[PDB]
Amino acid sequence: RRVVRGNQNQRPEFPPPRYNFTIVTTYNETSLPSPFINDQVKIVDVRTVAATRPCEMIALIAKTNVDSIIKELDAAHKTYSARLTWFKITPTCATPIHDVVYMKCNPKLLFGMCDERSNILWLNSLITTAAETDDELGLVLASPAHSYSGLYRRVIQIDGRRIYTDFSVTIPSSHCPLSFEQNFGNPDRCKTPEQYSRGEVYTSRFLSEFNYRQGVHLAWVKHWFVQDGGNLPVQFYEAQAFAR
């Protein structure tokens, strides 16, 4: 288990928690449904994202209809379970890079505001340069390398409904010395359509936990990016307005 270690006087400021949840580190797993689209037709929101300078921090963000599904369960007066999974997708295989399972979700509230969740899973080589956005549905990527270029797919599962968003990402060719190479295409983590179909993909077997709430994880990712020389885009600043 990854833990953050070091002197208190080197911490960033942490925004207050959004929702007090319990990580059920012992919950027993189900295989990952295939992210490939074949026999179940889906509408997909397709976005494009391009970094314009080396080591640029970027965010994969797109409004979805997730609330219209959550609030259908509210009108039914049903709590629900959910799953969030990010993939890097190629025609031959798909690599899950972030995966979370949610239980006892109150549909009066927003996505992710659920009493329980699984371990919060990440590709281990992304933990210091990646985190969720504030509503837990976006992905922040610090110091990408050129090899990050390609197709990213987010699958949100709410009860028995699924939402797909694709991001076509371009990163320029100059080298970023702050980056980590993810080797996204490695067959240990890049799983074929057949492997998903046969029910054989279990994220606990190859992703790693970073069981810190979003506000703490992103605060650290932004702090480490700047302390290593990165130029933080104003998009990732917080509002102080007139206060303090």
Residue numbers in the entry: 34 to 277
Original paper wording:
Equine herpesvirus type 1 (EHV-1) and EHV-4 gDs interact with equine major histocompatibility complex I (MHC-I) to initiate entry into equine cells. Of these, gD is the (main) receptor-binding protein that interacts with the cell receptors and triggers the subsequent fusion process with cell membrane and/or uptake by endocytosis. The structures of gD1 and gD4 revealed the existence of a common V-set immunoglobulin-like (IgV-like) core comparable to those of other gD homologs. The cores consist of a nine-stranded (A′, B, C, C′, C″, D, E, F, and G) β-barrel, arranged in a typical V-like Ig fold, flanked by N- and C-terminal extensions with loops, α-helices (α1, α2, α3’, and α3), and small β-strands (str2-4).
Glycoprotein D4 was crystallized with one protein per asymmetric unit. In total 244 residues could be modeled (R34 to R277). The overall folds of gD1 and gD4 are very similar with a root-mean-square deviation (rmsd) of 0.7 Å for 220 common Cα atoms. In the structures of gD1 and gD4, six cysteines were found to form three disulfide bonds at sites conserved in members of the gD plolypeptide family: C87/C209, C126/C223, and C138/C147. Apparent dissociation constants ( Kdapp ) of 7,000 ± 2,000 nM and 5,800 ± 760 nM were calculated for gD1 and gD4, respectively. Additionally, the receptor affinity of a C-terminally truncated EHV-4 gD, gD436-280, was tested. The truncated gD4 version, gD436-280, exhibited a receptor binding affinity to MHC-I in the same order of magnitude (6,700 ± 750 nM). That the C-terminal truncation had no significant effect on the receptor affinity of EHV-4 gD suggests that the mode of binding differs from other alphaherpesviruses, however, the role of the C-terminus remains to be determined. For EHV-4, the infection was reduced by an average of 32% after blocking the cells with soluble gD4 recombinant protein. gD4 was also able to block the entry of EHV-1 by 40%. The EHV-1 gD complex was one of the 3% best scored results and the EHV-4 gD complex was in the 11% top results suggesting that both docking solutions represent low-energy protein complexes.
